[PDB]
Amino acid sequence: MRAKWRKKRTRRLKRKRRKVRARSK
Amino acid sequence: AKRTKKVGITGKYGVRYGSSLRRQVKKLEIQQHARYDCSFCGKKTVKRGAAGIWTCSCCKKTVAGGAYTVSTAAAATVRSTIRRLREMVEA
Amino acid sequence: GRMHSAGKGISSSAIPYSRNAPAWFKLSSESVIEQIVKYARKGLTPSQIGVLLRDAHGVTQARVITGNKIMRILKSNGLAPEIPEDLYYLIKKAVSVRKHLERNRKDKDAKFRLILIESRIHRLARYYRTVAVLPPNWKYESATASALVN
């Protein structure tokens, strides 16, 4: 691991959550 | 006060045509209706009559121009290119 | 020091120890105050008035030749300017740098330096208001700054 691509994994993760969240809204 | 936040001149379109398409129009409408500077009489009185036609209300001068701005950038670089080519022919 | 920079240059005058001077002087202050006021009648500020007397004539300071100071000498004769000489110079620099930006949008250096200048104008207007030399509710603004210089 390295912090750039654990930070990058989390952004693709945060992108995923707002996408599924807005469906309920 | 401040009647609108960001729509500006494109408030006339209401909620139509899409946000991005409304702001392409806003930029060119801002220029095409702006008052430009008279390069002959020295006044801020140049107005667009029709696409490419810019008439200065004072001194009654019409200059050919771009569709929405008096002088397009591509034209201005042309005018300088001809100049440097001119000033060497009779150099 | 150098509030609006990082410079630390200690470059200044060094007043002589002898509070009486110069021990080789010509006719006394009765003529000095007459010369100071006549240089003031043609619009020279006390800085310019002091420099001219200091070098052209021999005057170490008008403060030891005369018990008073040049500005107080001018003030007593009714020639004190509407704004103190120092504040008039910050204002004119602001007017000059403001006009430059009106020709150069992209000069962000002028943007930084104009901000610093007006802050010095504000910290002097605030100080001059407490002293009551300047009236209160006196504010510097860009609209009337150009007319205030001249």
Partner: protein
């Protein structure tokens, strides 16, 4: 510099601004120098140069329009031609 010489003149010596005032000064012999803005109408330029040539008066061509020339003489409006009546403190007449 040309700007400071005008600035020294602008406050010491009398003068006239604009076209009609310049012409009467050129006519009556009061003028000793005129300044011509860059974007002035060339037909107007020719008539001024004719009187100057016909009254033995110098002519200067400022490198700027009526906008800057008015600012160069310390005014907030546009000046196309200015006829100085006397230098007063500066040395514009003896130079150039």
């Amino acid at each position: 510099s040309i700007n400071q010489k005008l600035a020294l003149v602008i406050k010491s010596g009398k003068y006239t601004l604009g076209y009609k005032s310049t012409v009467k000064s050129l006519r009556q012999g009061k003028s000793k120098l005129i300044i011509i803005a860059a974007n002035t109408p060339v037909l107007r330029k020719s008539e001024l140069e004719y009187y100057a040539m016909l009254s033995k008066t110098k002519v200067y061509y400022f490198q700027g329009g009526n906008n800057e020339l008015g600012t160069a003489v310390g005014k907030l409006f546009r000046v196309g031609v200015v006829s100085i009546l006397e230098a007063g403190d500066s040395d514009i007449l003896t130079t150039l």
